[PDB]
Amino acid sequence: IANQPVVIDNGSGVIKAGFAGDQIPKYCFPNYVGRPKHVRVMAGALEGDIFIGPKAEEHRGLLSIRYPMEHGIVKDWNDMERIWQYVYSKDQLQTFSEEHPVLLTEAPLNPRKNRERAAEVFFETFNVPALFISMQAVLSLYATGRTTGVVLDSGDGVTHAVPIYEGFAMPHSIMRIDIAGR
């Protein structure tokens, strides 16, 4: 039988995460792949060789940050796993891949191969019971409650004019320009 899903709001630049029914994504931090830049010497010098969050802010110019999300389109799938592991950790999820259903966000018309790659992760390495990944604009429409709506929204290195109306799939009218604030 299923469990409580986890509302994980990703994005080209910032990831948001909380469980189902919550009002606040309890685990928010941007989308980044950090790992050290120096020669570790003394004892107590934090191992893991990949650090996120307080360690990231704590070691800003000490950790080489990476952004494989080429306008959201990521390439360090292994590091994506580890990002989720950071979430999976006692820090954010404190659970397993099977202990909870997953919810995830998807930008429009991305290469399907990426999605499938993530599915390989989510159901082979990670073992998601049930999930679904789709348009963030749709979720924003749920928040507004509107059904008829041209959603203008931009990620961090992605811009996307999304003319929607009552869930009607209008990909010809719907656009996206993968360039933004990044």
Binding site: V39, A43, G44, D49
Partner: protein, 75 residues
Amino acid sequence: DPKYADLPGIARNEPDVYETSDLPQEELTSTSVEHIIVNPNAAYDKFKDKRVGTKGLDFSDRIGKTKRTGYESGE
């Protein structure tokens, strides 16, 4: 003394060893120093249990894979 007795020219009443009667930090006290002991055994036992892994921490004019880091392995 017996030599003094047997030698005629040797006079006496001589205080032989004639002598002269001779008669007999702040840096820590500054407005800003805090000289503190680390409590060697306390801090030692603290960091002692903190294992350190290493795996060929090699650096001297070694070319290949530009970035390097000491104490490579984990423990």
